[PDB]
Design a protein around this ligand. Structure first.
Ligand SMILES: c1cc(-c2ccc(CNC3CCCCC3)cc2)cs1
Length: 188
Protein backbone atom coordinates (compact mmCIF):
# COMPACT_ATOMS: atom_id res chain seq x y z
CA UNK A 1 0.00 0.00 0.00
CA UNK A 2 0.94 3.64 -0.31
CA UNK A 3 0.80 4.06 3.50
CA UNK A 4 2.50 1.19 5.29
CA UNK A 5 3.04 0.28 8.91
CA UNK A 6 6.78 0.72 9.46
CA UNK A 7 7.11 3.49 6.84
CA UNK A 8 5.07 6.61 7.58
CA UNK A 9 3.73 5.26 10.88
CA UNK A 10 3.93 2.42 13.36
CA UNK A 11 1.12 0.72 15.28
CA UNK A 12 1.09 0.46 19.06
CA UNK A 13 1.20 -3.14 20.20
CA UNK A 14 -0.76 -2.00 23.29
CA UNK A 15 -3.38 0.53 22.13
CA UNK A 16 -4.46 3.29 24.52
CA UNK A 17 -8.20 3.67 25.09
CA UNK A 18 -9.66 7.15 25.53
CA UNK A 19 -6.59 9.06 24.26
CA UNK A 20 -6.88 12.47 22.55
CA UNK A 21 -7.51 12.36 18.80
CA UNK A 22 -4.15 14.02 18.04
CA UNK A 23 -1.56 13.93 20.83
CA UNK A 24 1.91 15.45 20.50
CA UNK A 25 4.82 15.13 22.94
CA UNK A 26 7.81 17.51 22.90
CA UNK A 27 10.63 18.83 25.03
CA UNK A 28 12.04 22.33 25.04
CA UNK A 29 15.46 20.57 24.99
CA UNK A 30 14.66 18.66 21.77
CA UNK A 31 16.32 19.98 18.56
CA UNK A 32 13.69 18.54 16.15
CA UNK A 33 10.95 19.95 18.43
CA UNK A 34 12.53 23.38 18.07
CA UNK A 35 12.38 23.05 14.30
CA UNK A 36 8.79 21.64 14.44
CA UNK A 37 7.79 24.83 16.25
CA UNK A 38 9.76 27.62 14.57
CA UNK A 39 10.52 26.46 11.00
CA UNK A 40 8.19 23.62 10.01
CA UNK A 41 5.08 24.61 12.00
CA UNK A 42 4.02 20.97 12.22
CA UNK A 43 1.07 21.43 14.60
CA UNK A 44 -0.55 24.15 12.52
CA UNK A 45 -0.06 22.33 9.23
CA UNK A 46 -1.59 19.19 10.73
CA UNK A 47 -4.49 21.24 12.10
CA UNK A 48 -5.24 22.70 8.70
CA UNK A 49 -5.51 19.25 7.16
CA UNK A 50 -7.92 17.89 9.77
CA UNK A 51 -11.64 18.71 10.02
CA UNK A 52 -12.69 21.79 11.97
CA UNK A 53 -12.92 21.33 15.72
CA UNK A 54 -10.77 18.20 16.15
CA UNK A 55 -8.98 18.10 19.51
CA UNK A 56 -5.19 18.40 19.35
CA UNK A 57 -3.24 18.08 22.58
CA UNK A 58 0.44 18.88 23.17
CA UNK A 59 2.32 17.79 26.29
CA UNK A 60 5.87 18.29 27.58
CA UNK A 61 8.11 15.41 28.77
CA UNK A 62 10.52 14.98 31.64
CA UNK A 63 13.20 12.75 30.27
CA UNK A 64 15.50 15.43 28.73
CA UNK A 65 17.22 18.00 30.87
CA UNK A 66 17.18 16.53 34.38
CA UNK A 67 15.89 18.98 37.02
CA UNK A 68 15.12 21.64 34.44
CA UNK A 69 13.25 19.14 32.28
CA UNK A 70 10.80 18.58 35.14
CA UNK A 71 10.66 22.34 35.79
CA UNK A 72 9.69 22.83 32.14
CA UNK A 73 6.92 20.23 32.35
CA UNK A 74 5.52 22.14 35.32
CA UNK A 75 5.86 25.44 33.46
CA UNK A 76 4.06 23.92 30.46
CA UNK A 77 1.28 22.94 32.88
CA UNK A 78 1.18 26.60 33.96
CA UNK A 79 1.04 27.69 30.31
CA UNK A 80 -1.87 25.30 29.64
CA UNK A 81 -3.71 26.38 32.80
CA UNK A 82 -3.42 30.07 31.85
CA UNK A 83 -3.92 29.51 28.14
CA UNK A 84 -0.66 31.29 27.22
CA UNK A 85 1.06 28.48 25.25
CA UNK A 86 1.26 30.62 22.11
CA UNK A 87 2.95 33.45 24.09
CA UNK A 88 5.73 31.40 25.74
CA UNK A 89 6.60 28.55 23.37
CA UNK A 90 9.09 30.40 21.17
CA UNK A 91 10.88 32.25 24.02
CA UNK A 92 11.15 29.04 26.02
CA UNK A 93 12.63 27.20 23.02
CA UNK A 94 15.04 30.05 22.33
CA UNK A 95 15.99 30.44 26.00
CA UNK A 96 16.83 26.75 26.27
CA UNK A 97 18.49 26.05 22.89
CA UNK A 98 19.51 29.36 21.21
CA UNK A 99 20.61 31.84 23.90
CA UNK A 100 20.97 29.22 26.68
CA UNK A 101 19.72 31.79 29.17
CA UNK A 102 17.32 29.35 30.89
CA UNK A 103 19.27 27.68 33.67
CA UNK A 104 16.80 27.66 36.58
CA UNK A 105 13.14 27.75 37.47
CA UNK A 106 13.58 31.49 38.04
CA UNK A 107 14.79 31.95 34.45
CA UNK A 108 11.69 30.11 33.23
CA UNK A 109 9.50 32.46 35.24
CA UNK A 110 11.27 35.45 33.65
CA UNK A 111 10.10 34.27 30.21
CA UNK A 112 6.50 34.37 31.41
CA UNK A 113 6.99 37.78 33.04
CA UNK A 114 8.48 39.16 29.82
CA UNK A 115 5.51 37.72 27.90
CA UNK A 116 3.13 39.73 30.11
CA UNK A 117 1.95 37.13 32.65
CA UNK A 118 1.82 38.90 36.01
CA UNK A 119 4.14 37.48 38.65
CA UNK A 120 1.39 36.88 41.19
CA UNK A 121 -0.62 34.96 38.58
CA UNK A 122 2.38 32.84 37.54
CA UNK A 123 3.26 31.98 41.13
CA UNK A 124 -0.34 31.15 42.10
CA UNK A 125 -0.56 28.77 39.10
CA UNK A 126 2.90 27.27 39.64
CA UNK A 127 1.92 26.23 43.20
CA UNK A 128 -1.69 25.24 42.44
CA UNK A 129 -3.15 21.75 42.66
CA UNK A 130 -4.75 22.39 39.26
CA UNK A 131 -1.18 22.55 37.88
CA UNK A 132 -0.06 19.49 39.88
CA UNK A 133 -2.94 17.65 38.20
CA UNK A 134 -1.88 18.87 34.76
CA UNK A 135 1.67 17.68 35.48
CA UNK A 136 0.29 14.26 36.42
CA UNK A 137 -1.78 14.26 33.23
CA UNK A 138 1.29 14.91 31.08
CA UNK A 139 3.26 12.16 32.81
CA UNK A 140 0.40 9.65 32.49
CA UNK A 141 -0.16 10.27 28.79
CA UNK A 142 3.55 9.71 28.09
CA UNK A 143 3.82 6.66 30.34
CA UNK A 144 0.92 4.95 28.62
CA UNK A 145 3.17 4.58 25.52
CA UNK A 146 6.50 4.13 27.35
CA UNK A 147 7.49 7.23 25.46
CA UNK A 148 10.96 6.74 24.04
CA UNK A 149 11.75 9.96 22.29
CA UNK A 150 10.35 13.21 20.99
CA UNK A 151 8.94 14.79 18.89
CA UNK A 152 6.19 12.15 18.92
CA UNK A 153 2.63 12.28 17.60
CA UNK A 154 -0.07 9.71 18.30
CA UNK A 155 -3.36 9.39 16.43
CA UNK A 156 -6.39 8.01 18.24
CA UNK A 157 -4.29 6.29 20.86
CA UNK A 158 -3.31 3.74 18.19
CA UNK A 159 -0.81 4.99 15.61
CA UNK A 160 2.51 6.78 16.05
CA UNK A 161 3.92 9.00 13.32
CA UNK A 162 7.27 7.85 11.85
CA UNK A 163 9.00 10.96 10.43
CA UNK A 164 12.26 9.02 9.85
CA UNK A 165 10.48 7.30 6.96
CA UNK A 166 9.51 10.57 5.21
CA UNK A 167 11.23 12.90 2.73
CA UNK A 168 14.15 14.93 4.08
CA UNK A 169 15.30 16.85 1.00
CA UNK A 170 12.61 19.53 1.16
CA UNK A 171 11.13 21.00 4.33
CA UNK A 172 7.68 21.61 2.87
CA UNK A 173 7.42 18.18 1.24
CA UNK A 174 8.24 16.63 4.63
CA UNK A 175 5.59 18.73 6.38
CA UNK A 176 3.04 17.78 3.70
CA UNK A 177 3.78 14.07 3.99
CA UNK A 178 3.59 14.28 7.78
CA UNK A 179 0.25 16.11 7.79
CA UNK A 180 -1.23 13.89 5.07
CA UNK A 181 -0.20 10.88 7.13
CA UNK A 182 -2.00 12.26 10.17
CA UNK A 183 -5.08 12.80 8.01
CA UNK A 184 -4.89 9.21 6.68
CA UNK A 185 -4.51 7.77 10.17
CA UNK A 186 -7.39 9.90 11.49
CA UNK A 187 -9.64 8.37 8.77
CA UNK A 188 -8.78 4.76 9.73
C1 LIG B 1 12.35 11.45 16.50
C2 LIG B 1 11.88 12.34 15.47
C3 LIG B 1 12.86 12.30 14.29
C4 LIG B 1 12.74 13.12 13.00
C5 LIG B 1 13.35 12.68 11.83
C6 LIG B 1 13.25 13.45 10.67
C7 LIG B 1 12.56 14.65 10.71
C8 LIG B 1 12.45 15.55 9.44
N1 LIG B 1 13.59 16.51 9.46
C9 LIG B 1 14.03 17.01 8.15
C10 LIG B 1 14.96 18.22 8.37
C11 LIG B 1 14.79 19.37 7.37
C12 LIG B 1 14.42 18.93 5.95
C13 LIG B 1 13.18 18.03 5.93
C14 LIG B 1 12.87 17.32 7.26
C15 LIG B 1 11.97 15.08 11.89
C16 LIG B 1 12.05 14.31 13.04
C17 LIG B 1 13.96 11.42 14.57
S1 LIG B 1 13.75 10.76 16.02
Amino acid sequence: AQYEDGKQYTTLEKPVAGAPQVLEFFSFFCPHCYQFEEVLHISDNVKKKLPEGVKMTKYHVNFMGGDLGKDLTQAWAVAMALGVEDKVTVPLFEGVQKTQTIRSASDIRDVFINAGIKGEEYDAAWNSFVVKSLVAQQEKAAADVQLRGVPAMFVNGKYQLNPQGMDTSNMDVFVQQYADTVKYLSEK
